[PDB]
Write a protein that binds this DNA or RNA. Structure first.
Ligand SMILES: [Mg+2]
Lengths: 145, 661, 49, 453
RNA sequence: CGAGAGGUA
DNA sequence: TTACCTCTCG
């Protein structure tokens, strides 16, 4: 029912939505570093996390709706899911004039800078809940107040 | 394409003491400055005139009645040709009472005070800049403790270089006696520190570029032997690790942002314009006077006590001043954000008082309550009723509601037709309910749409537009098929009506918000207006059918329907003349091409004759064919009900086509 | 109502502003890769470029 | 040229997501970078980096020109991210006429000057060497921004040396009153160094850097620092990919390498020499990706099998792996990354100081005597007799004469090490200069000559 | 005007 | 949760 949808959308715990998923994400991150280099490993790891997460979240909300006979199109859920899954977190090890240690930057941005800059940007995807997402935005006026 | 470009921006920033002054300052014809309000008086004691230097003073905040000055004479505003902007007798500002809504005033404070928000947050902005223990900076602020080395900017002869120290027992009198009058003052200002003047001064002479340098180095050094110890320890190592990043960031912004760090402790204090705090006489309202006003007086008072205390008693010790410094700070705090420290700060009869932060916060906070939605004119409400005969584009509006909503439009009409001389003349005609008013109303609303909404507006379809038709009675009639979108039933539901005034608005409603244009729902594409209850019952009955075997004949048909009709019209006719019933089977000649939905079933019997004609009997049809293999006739077995639905769908298509032409 | 208020806030700013972004990437839908009843396969695909 | 960076981005956006006729060209990217670089109000550096990323992505269609390299160097320098600035410089140099562009008539903070000043503070003098040399090929004079510190000794030529912020010993004590009269005396302006509340940096040096000048480090300190990192990386490879290795003598060696590596920061030496990380090698990584080198749609759990899935579904592919080096086609870098550094030595410094002095001398610089004194003292610390002849020659060349005691002690050092011939040469030139050799040393020099004969 | 209470759909 | 209505009370 509705409680489950609130839980899925407000991602308080990544594992809470799917156990199989947490497994994969913690696992991927530890393993990927050894196999691949700095310019390319964070980027590939991000792309893989982003892809599984996206499939699972849409599929979980949808199963709840299909059980009760309510049919809503996918495009609509996808506009919402993207915002949850669009940002990355720079890590503790990373300090440069360009980037501070704990910040939220967008995925397309980070990826672009990484190709360009030899400076190490270390990042990992953070799933943001519906509530948190609003608080981090471009407009103080409304989007954030 | 080249985009049409529009650039707009909104900027928020903390303000300097000089600005708050300029927001509220004017120089009169006498050349005298006005603006600071010193006295706590509100109006007068049973005189109902604003007092001078008062929270409602005309001179500082503008005139109360237009053109009538403090003295009581009236000069006509709208003319500045020979009008003293400020009268010799009084500061008049003759032009408008509107100013009391927008004009601002400022209060001077003897003691520096501190804003709550920067201090209150756990990652205190002031603390992040200070790099000193949060408790130490706070202790000085709320309790009597004294810093010893306030400014690193200038050299000082005394050299303990201490932090806040409780004991002033150190010889202080002999030091003053040895020192010259105020020689001590120069030394004390450099060294001994109290209240928040100290914070203001420490913040004021600080080296940001240097602050970054120290921080980065310390941040780099920390993390030595990181991630290699007992759980308790790492946690601590990290918390410092972050405070460090946070602090570097705040400073960097300050370097490139044009906002001065000292402005956080406040010298002057701002006052809301007098109208926004109506504090009208509580003439039985009992809450008409604002708590804004109540809180304001307290700060005003303690401050005046201090200004005098210092002037009156230089001899009295710092203990007298220290006592009331804290008092002033606390009043300001409650005015800005009470409940931040959790102090009740409430009069016993009263609820905890309303801090300005409360005014802004929440559903009833300014932004949600007023900014996002507001009450409007040209609107009405009433209960709803079924209205079956209406068309999809029309709605029925009670006449009493209409006369209210379309009044301006009718007045114009009465005047244009010269049935009345003046606006007042017409309003009278509207009241006597003369019959002509009704002919004019009808004319005005003919091509003008109207908008209807139900209360819980879950989805777009909650608001739709219709062409109004005048009805007598007091309820709004709605088409049967629009009820799903509005989620409406006819057991006590009510609706609201709005009228679109501008031409631009009127085009949008006819072209983008009418039902014919919005027949498909947003979620998956499904039809939203389909026959639903009784209507469905009727359609089912028409197409339901007839008893087929044991139900229609008692004994096997072996031992042993009839009507044959040539055109469909005849059949429909027989139903009316009671010749046949709705369910009785009949045969109809079909001249068209086998469109009947039926199963894929081979013929039950084919009967073939010697000269060459063959008759084929299928369950719902007979096809007669000849030697040349041509279909001479087709006959369909059906019921009157089936032909009636087909005919209506067909005729509607043809009728719409013939109308266009 | 709480769920709706919050969902509108996350995605209020999105309007269609341009004809083509210029991407050359697309998601791939297979009948397999999930056990998909044909219904599901059809519904995902209708309306897409 | 407006001052508001955004108005330009809006025009760019109309172009980037539009039809082909209107697509961006190299001139366009360059105009937007200017707006962000020459803006006075906010950080605007992440933004430049993102824009660069877009250009790299459109590599096949668009390639860089000179202004590109120019603009880029200003931004990274002014913002103190010097490491990237140097990578870009490598390119502007290849072009001809480049230096002229970077110094835009000195109009906006003298970007060319800012580069040099920074490279020095950071102790990146090997790079200074390259740059100062580069300028020459272009006949562009060193700009006036090179300036003396409160201690007049500081100058690009003498600063990188280890004793820092210390006035050089000239024999005669520096005439303090004389310096004052020179800068401002009776009338005139001197940057009186008294601290003030307003936020304008006190060092005149800081001007032109957005936030502040780079922190000071000596060639020495920098060299130790650079060294640790290369080593750390080898240790890092060891930490994650290195527990297992090709060598069969590894089990005994592992115990040794790990403790030692830790020691370096704070036999099998040949094996360490053998170990390398391939960084900047897109190809190596590519091979690795290829692999040559409940009940819903779940990606396969092993990393390598995921890679096969990523490909089948078209999420990522080999074509996608490129960086600036591949895209802009610069081949110079491959060589630089693999090599470990050269360790610090007092002698290493001497060679570099001298080379620098002539080029600055070549290009119009006026190093102070104190600067030369700085080189001189350094030479004395680890014996380097030959340098003494050229350097004293240069100082007088610069129309400067040193105090006598410093002169004699070096002559004594030459006598001590047996360079009698050098001592005579010094006396012969000293006569030409007209300065007087100390008599006691002079008789001793004659006696030493008699001993040699 | 600020609180409280009873309803409606 | 939204909207709507009436009242009393200092
Ligand atoms: Mg109802």
């Amino acid at each position: 029912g509705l409680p489950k949808v609130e839980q899925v959308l407000e991602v308080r715990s990544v594992d809470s939505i799917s156990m199989n998923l947490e497994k994969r994400i913690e696992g991927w991150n530890k393993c990927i570093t050894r196999i691949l280099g700095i310019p390319w490993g964070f980027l590939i790891g991000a792309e893989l996390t982003i892809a599984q997460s996206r499939i699972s979240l849409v599929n979980k909300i949808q199963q709840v709706y299909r059980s009760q006979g309510v049919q809503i199109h996918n495009r609509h859920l996808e506009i919402i899911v993207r915002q949850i899954t669009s940002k990355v977190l720079v890590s503790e090890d990373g300090m440069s004039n360009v980037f501070s240690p704990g910040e939220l930057i967008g995925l397309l941005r980070a990826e672009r800078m990484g190709r360009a800059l030899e400076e190490a940007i270390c990042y990992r995807v953070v799933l943001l809940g519906i509530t948190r997402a609003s608080l981090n935005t471009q407009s103080f006026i409304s989007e954030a107040s | 394409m080249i985009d049409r470009y529009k650039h707009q921006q909104l900027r928020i920033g903390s303000v300097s003491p000089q600005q708050i002054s300029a927001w509220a300052t004017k120089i009169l014809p006498n050349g005298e400055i006005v603006g600071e309000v010193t006295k706590p008086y509100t109006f007068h004691y049973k005189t109902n005139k604003p007092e001078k230097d008062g929270l409602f003073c005309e001179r500082i905040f503008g005139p109360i009645k237009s053109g009538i000055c403090a003295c009581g004479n009236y000069r006509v505003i709208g003319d500045e040709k020979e009008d003293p902007k400020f009268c010799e007798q009084c500061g008049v500002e003759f032009v408008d009472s509107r100013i009391r809504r927008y004009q601002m005033g400022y209060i001077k404070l003897a003691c520096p005070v501190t804003h709550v928000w920067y201090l209150k947050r756990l990652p205190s902005y002031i603390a992040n800049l200070l790099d000193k223990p949060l408790k130490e900076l706070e202790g000085l602020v709320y309790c009597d403790f004294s810093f010893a080395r306030p400014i690193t900017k200038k050299p000082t002869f005394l050299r303990l270089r201490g932090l806040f120290e409780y004991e002033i027992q150190s010889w202080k009198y002999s030091i003053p006696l040895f020192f010259t009058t105020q020689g001590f003052d120069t030394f004390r200002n450099r060294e001994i520190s109290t209240g928040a003047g100290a914070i203001r001064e420490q913040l004021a002479d600080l080296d940001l570029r240097i602050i970054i340098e120290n921080s980065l180095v310390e941040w780099e050094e920390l993390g030595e032997e990181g991630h290699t110890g007992n759980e308790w320890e790492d946690r601590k190592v990290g918390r410092r690790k972050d405070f460090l990043v946070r602090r570097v960031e705040l400073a960097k912004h300050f370097i490139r942002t044009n906002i001065e760090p000292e402005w956080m402790v406040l010298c002057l204090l701002p006052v809301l314009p007098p109208e926004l705090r109506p504090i009208i006489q509580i003439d039985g309202g009992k809450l008409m006077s604002s708590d804004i006003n109540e809180l304001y007086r307290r700060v005003i008072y303690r401050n005046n006590t201090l200004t005098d205390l210092l002037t009156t008693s230089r001899s009295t010790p710092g203990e007298l001043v220290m006592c009331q410094e804290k008092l002033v700070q606390e009043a300001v705090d409650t005015l800005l954000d009470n409940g931040i420290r959790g102090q009740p700060m409430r009069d016993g009869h009263n609820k905890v008082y309303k801090s300005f932060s409360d005014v802004i916060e929440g559903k009833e906070g300014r932004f949600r309550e007023t900014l996002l939605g507001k009450r409007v004119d040209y609107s009405g409400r009433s209960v709803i009723v079924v209205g079956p005969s209406l068309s999809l584009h029309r709605c029925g509006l009670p006449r009493e509601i209409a006369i209210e909503l379309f009044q301006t439009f009718v007045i114009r009409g009465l005047i244009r037709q010269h049935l009345a001389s003046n606006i007042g003349v017409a309003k009278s005609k509207i009241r006597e309910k003369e019959p002509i008013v009704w002919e004019i109303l009808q004319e005005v609303m003919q091509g003008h749409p109207v908008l209807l909404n139900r209360a819980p507006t879950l989805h777009r379809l909650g608001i739709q537009a219709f062409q109004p038709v005048l009805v007598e009675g007091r309820a709004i009639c709605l088409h049967p098929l629009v009820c799903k979108g509005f989620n409406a039933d006819f057991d006590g539901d009510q609706m609201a009506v709005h009228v679109p005034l501008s031409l631009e608005a009127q085009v949008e409603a006819r072209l983008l918000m009418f039902s014919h244009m919005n027949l498909l729902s947003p979620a998956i594409g499904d039809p939203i207006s389909v026959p639903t209850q009784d209507m469905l019952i009727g359609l089912y009955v028409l197409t339901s059918g007839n008893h087929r075997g044991i139900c229609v004949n008692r004994y096997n048909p072996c031992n042993r329907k009839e009507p044959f009709f040539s055109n469909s019209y005849d059949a429909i006719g027989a139903y009316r003349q009671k010749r046949i019933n709705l369910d009785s089977p009949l045969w109809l000649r079909w001249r068209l091409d086998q469109r009947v939905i039926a199963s894929r079933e081979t013929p039950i019997e084919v009967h073939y004759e010697s000269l060459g004609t063959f008759y084929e009997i299928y369950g719902h049809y007979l096809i007669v064919r000849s030697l040349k293999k041509q279909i001479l006739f087709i006959y369909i077995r059906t019921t009157v009900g089936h032909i009636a639905l087909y005919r209506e769908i067909e005729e509607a298509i043809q009728g719409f086509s013939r109308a266009y032409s | 109502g709480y769920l709706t208020r919050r969902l509108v806030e996350v995605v209020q700013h999105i309007v269609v502003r341009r004809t083509d972004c210029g991407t050359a990437r697309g998601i791939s839908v297979s009948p397999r890769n999930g056990m998909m009843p044909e219904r599901i396969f059809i519904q995902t695909l209708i309306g897409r470029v | 040229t407006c001052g508001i960076p955004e108005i330009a981005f809006a025009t760019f956006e109309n172009m980037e997501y539009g039809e082909d006729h209107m697509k961006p060209d190299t001139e366009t990217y360059n105009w937007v970078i200017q707006a962000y670089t020459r803006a006075e109000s906010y950080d605007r550096v992440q933004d430049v980096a993102e824009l660069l990323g877009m250009m790299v992505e459109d590599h096949k269609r668009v390639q860089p020109n000179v202004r590109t390299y120019a603009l880029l160097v200003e931004c990274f320098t002014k913002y103190c991210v010097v490491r990237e600035a140097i990578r870009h410089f490598r390119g502007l140099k290849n072009f001809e006429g480049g230096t002229q562009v970077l110094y835009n008539d000195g109009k906006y903070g003298d970007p060319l000057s800012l580069y040099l000043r920074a490279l020095c503070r950071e102790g990146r003098i090997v790079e200074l060497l390259e740059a100062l040399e580069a300028m020459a090929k272009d006949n562009q004079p060193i700009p006036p921004r090179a300036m003396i510190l409160s201690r007049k000794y500081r100058t690009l030529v003498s600063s990188w040396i280890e004793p820092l912020q210390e006035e050089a010993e000239l024999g005669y004590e520096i005439d303090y009153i004389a310096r004052y009269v020179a800068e401002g005396g009776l009338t005139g302006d001197r940057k009186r160094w008294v601290p003030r509340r307003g936020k304008t940096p006190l060092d005149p040096d800081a001007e032109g850097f957005i936030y502040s000048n780079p922190r000071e480090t000596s060639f020495k300190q920098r060299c130790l620092e650079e060294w640790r990192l290369h080593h750390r990386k080898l240790l890092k490879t060891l930490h994650n990919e290195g527990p297992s290795i090709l060598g069969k003598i590894s089990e005994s060696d592992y115990i040794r390498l790990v403790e030692r590596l830790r020691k370096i920061i704070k036999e099998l030496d040949e094996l360490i020499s053998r170990i390398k990380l391939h960084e900047g090698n897109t190809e190596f990584w590519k091979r690795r990706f290829l692999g040559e080198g409940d009940d819903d749609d779940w990606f396969p759990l092993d990393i390598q099998e995921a890679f096969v899935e990523m490909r089948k579904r078209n999420i990522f592919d080999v074509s996608d792996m490129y960086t600036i080096t591949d895209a802009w086609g610069w081949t110079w870098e491959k060589e630089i990354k693999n090599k470990a550094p050269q360790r610090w030595s007092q002698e290493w410094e001497v060679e570099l100081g001298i080379k620098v002095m002539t080029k600055v001398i070549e290009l119009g610089g006026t190093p102070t005597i104190g600067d030369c004194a700085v080189i001189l003292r350094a030479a004395v610390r680890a014996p380097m007799p030959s340098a003494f002849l050229n350097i004293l020659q240069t100082t007088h060349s610069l129309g400067y004469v040193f105090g006598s005691p410093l002169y004699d002690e070096i002559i004594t050092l030459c006598l001590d090490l047996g360079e009698l011939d050098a001592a005579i040469a010094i006396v012969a030139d000293l006569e030409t200069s007209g300065i007087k050799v100390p008599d006691e040393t002079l008789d001793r020099v004659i006696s030493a000559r008699q001993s040699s004969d």
